[PDB]
Amino acid sequence: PPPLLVYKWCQGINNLQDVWETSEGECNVMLESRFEKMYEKIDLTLLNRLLRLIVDHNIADYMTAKNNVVINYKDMNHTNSYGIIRGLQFASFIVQYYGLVMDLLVLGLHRASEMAGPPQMPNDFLSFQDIATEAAHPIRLFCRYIDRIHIFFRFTADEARDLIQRYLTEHPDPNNENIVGYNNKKCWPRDARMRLMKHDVNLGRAVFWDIKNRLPRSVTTVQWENSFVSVYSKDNPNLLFNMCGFECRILPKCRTSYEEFTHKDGVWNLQNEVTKERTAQCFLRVDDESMQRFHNRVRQILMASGSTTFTKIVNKWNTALIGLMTYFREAVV
Amino acid sequence: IKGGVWRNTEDEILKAAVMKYGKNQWSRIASLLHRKSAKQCKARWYEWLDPSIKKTEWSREEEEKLLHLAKLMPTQWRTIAPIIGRTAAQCLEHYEFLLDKAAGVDYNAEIPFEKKPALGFYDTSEENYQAL
Amino acid sequence: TRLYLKAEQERQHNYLKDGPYITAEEAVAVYTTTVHWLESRRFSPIPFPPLSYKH
């Protein structure tokens, strides 16, 4: 179930090799985004050849030929020659398979094969054949939920610097004359000058930009506006992200946790699988858009019923309310 | 249960109904027929009965165009059908045929409101008129 | 609904007029990459369901 996925994701982070160690200047990057228009930009002609690689050509020609039909609403009629129809029974399989393709784009074949591992002994959700397979590459955890992308990066200082140098290369705009050259006093020591506040953004935008450049715009795209980035570095203790409905924060004990304490079950303890120790804490919070959906659901109950019986409304309430509570539980408090 | 084969009676009555009521009212036309629904009546109009549909052999140009396009956009019949000017089902059948053969008193009492005509340079005194 | 279907009809018509946006060489890159993946993964194709299928 999705929340259990959140748990696999947190303990998946906390079980990574030397994940929280900032000693040498290591930098962690969480990146969340959407493919923006994905369904709408699938090309039928291409989708046919892509399905011919999977199933008997007949099945492929059926599936494809189905996405080409007439959409009617009252007066209006038109043909859909391009975008995929979501409402098809089997549309799911098209979505997930095409998504597999674009995943193969994003991760790259070498790394992807490393994750799925050898087909003779495939891996589970998050784990690798060996530690050296973990340290072998910046991309560490890659989770795709329908059209949403959740990625977790581990960088040594050099790799990060390289990325920063490439983004801050042909990515100037160049524009922003006022911002770019801002004068300050080189006479003084660093600490008596422009401290480090936004410098953390650089690494982030360099990440997001690097990801985007692996997706050809005509296929799909990613908009900085809808995406979100978080970064863990010696300047930033906290690691924030959002999976499914859950807003998650992660604070290690290796950083400044000060007083160690328990709390209501809204606090998860991330336990090292190896050492059976509680190495960090994950706080849960119910995401905004979720609360918004629930509120529109209540508003749906009030508005859509002017006629309906009073016992009926209470059923509507109870259903929605357990719908929220069974799902979120701890995060609600 | 409603579904079934189309009948000359249902089809001619469909002609007349479409003629009288117009293209955009389907529920009214489905009301007259039995054992058929509105969707079925509409799609039965635009698929087959519609006089603008071309029922005849395919010329050489239409076969060239159909084959080329079908090799251009595989399996998309509703995109191709308008380009060649034929019905999707028809050009389908013809394609499989090409591969197959290839191998209260204000009124009646008192004059409602009266404007006596204005009087002008001439004598209206004398004039009066006859009864009926 | 009506607006959305309008801009929809627009986008279909513009996709036919302006041709496929994926260009060509890109599409070949996709098809090829997928091929390599399914190759290294020993994936056998899914056949058509036979008349006699116990499931």
Binding site: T45, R49 | - | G19, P20, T23, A24
Partner: peptide, 27 residues
Amino acid sequence: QEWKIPPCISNWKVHINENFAKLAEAL
């Protein structure tokens, strides 16, 4: 004659690009 107005009797009350060829043949 010019201002004859067609009666508004009420009903209520396509081209293709050649790039598709290059693409399809490419695939």
